[PDB]
């Protein structure tokens, strides 16, 4: 707070040291800017919390930050370099990611390959397990717009603005994987949230289709995530033993190149 820690080293800085390269996200958990140090050109993400802002949004920004600051030892969660508090704003400095999984989907204009989703699942399951085990934290909003990738191949979870302390996170992962694997949100034509809830309860889980070349491992994993009965739905420690996860923990996947190629389309 008032200076930044990067590489485990402290650098004095202030908001005036940064130039604004424009907005990357806003709306649910604050305005996020891409920003650049005026003297070096190095780039970071900066979330801005306005003192005069919507009070509910400010409560979300602050919960998210609380979790990010707690999670400095988790490599699957975006890291915070520090904060600047002015009379009118709070600026939260964070490591810049390349884009979210939702944008990759839209750019791809179709299915994201299993191998990429394998890496993604590993990272995201580990992020959720860390949050749960270390912090008693549940995310409550896992979805492609909250999954961040970069040109180095890294994958992280973000936006814990409505995370609760003390089930359905696993379900939201399963759904996100089906969405990304097919390029179709399985609750596409639902006009209303309540409609989506009725489908979740009344219909069979939206499993991965059988004739797209998905491995049995990937199909099994998704089917486990999408188990409607919570007594049957695996704990994270058991999902981390799943063969799908074991495969991609080890497997060499060039997510970095994949990502650069997609971002060139």
Swiss-Prot record:
GO terms for molecular function: ATP binding; enzyme binding; JUN kinase kinase activity; magnesium ion binding; MAP kinase activity; MAP kinase kinase activity; molecular function activator activity; protein kinase binding. GO terms for biological process: apoptotic process; cellular response to interleukin-1; cellular response to lipopolysaccharide; cellular senescence; Fc-epsilon receptor signaling pathway; JNK cascade; positive regulation of DNA-templated transcription; positive regulation of ERK1 and ERK2 cascade. Residues 18-245 form the Protein kinase domain. It is found in: Nucleus; Cytoplasm. The keyword Kinase applies. Its cofactor is Mg(2+). Ubiquitous; with highest level of expression in skeletal muscle. Isoform 3 is found at low levels in placenta, fetal liver, and skeletal muscle. Its main location: nucleus. Residues 242-265 are annotated as: DVD domain. The active site is at residue 141. Its EC number is 2.7.12.2. Keywords: Acetylation, Apoptosis, ATP-binding, Coiled coil, Cytoplasm, Kinase, Magnesium, Metal-binding, Nucleotide-binding, Nucleus, Phosphoprotein, Serine/threonine-protein kinase, Stress response, Transferase, Tyrosine-protein kinase. GO terms for cellular component: cytoplasm; cytosol; nucleus. ATP binds at residues 24-32, 47. It catalyses: L-seryl-[protein] + ATP = O-phospho-L-seryl-[protein] + ADP + H(+); L-threonyl-[protein] + ATP = O-phospho-L-threonyl-[protein] + ADP + H(+); L-tyrosyl-[protein] + ATP = O-phospho-L-tyrosyl-[protein] + ADP + H(+). Activated by phosphorylation by specific MAP kinase kinase kinases such as MAP3K1/MEKK1, MAP3K3/MEKK3, MAP3K11/MLK3 and MAP3K12/DLK. The DVD domain (residues 377-400) contains a conserved docking site and is found in the mammalian MAP kinase kinases (MAP2Ks). The DVD sites bind to their specific upstream MAP kinase kinase kinases (MAP3Ks) and are essential for activation. The D domain (residues 37-57) contains a conserved docking site and is required for the binding to MAPK substrates. Interacts with isoform 1 of VRK2. Interacts (via its D domain) with its substrates MAPK8/JNK1, MAPK9/JNK2 and MAPK10/JNK3. Interacts (via its DVD domain) with MAP3Ks activators like MAP3K5/ASK1 and MAP3K1/MEKK1. Interacts with MAPK8IP1/JIP1, MAPK8IP2/JIP2 and MAPK8IP3/JIP3 scaffold proteins. Interacts with RASSF7, the interaction promotes phosphorylation. Found in a complex with SH3RF1, RAC1, MAP3K11/MLK3, MAPK8IP1/JIP1 and MAPK8/JNK1. Found in a complex with SH3RF1, RAC2, MAP3K7/TAK1, MAPK8IP1/JIP1, MAPK8/JNK1 and MAPK9/JNK2. Dual specificity protein kinase which acts as an essential component of the MAP kinase signal transduction pathway. Essential component of the stress-activated protein kinase/c-Jun N-terminal kinase (SAP/JNK) signaling pathway. With MAP2K4/MKK4, is the one of the only known kinase to directly activate the stress-activated protein kinase/c-Jun N-terminal kinases MAPK8/JNK1, MAPK9/JNK2 and MAPK10/JNK3. MAP2K4/MKK4 and MAP2K7/MKK7 both activate the JNKs by phosphorylation, but they differ in their preference for the phosphorylation site in the Thr-Pro-Tyr motif. Belongs to the protein kinase superfamily. STE Ser/Thr protein kinase family. MAP kinase kinase subfamily. This is Dual specificity mitogen-activated protein kinase kinase 7. It comes from Homo sapiens (Human). The lineage of its organism: Eukaryota, Metazoa, Chordata, Craniata, Vertebrata.
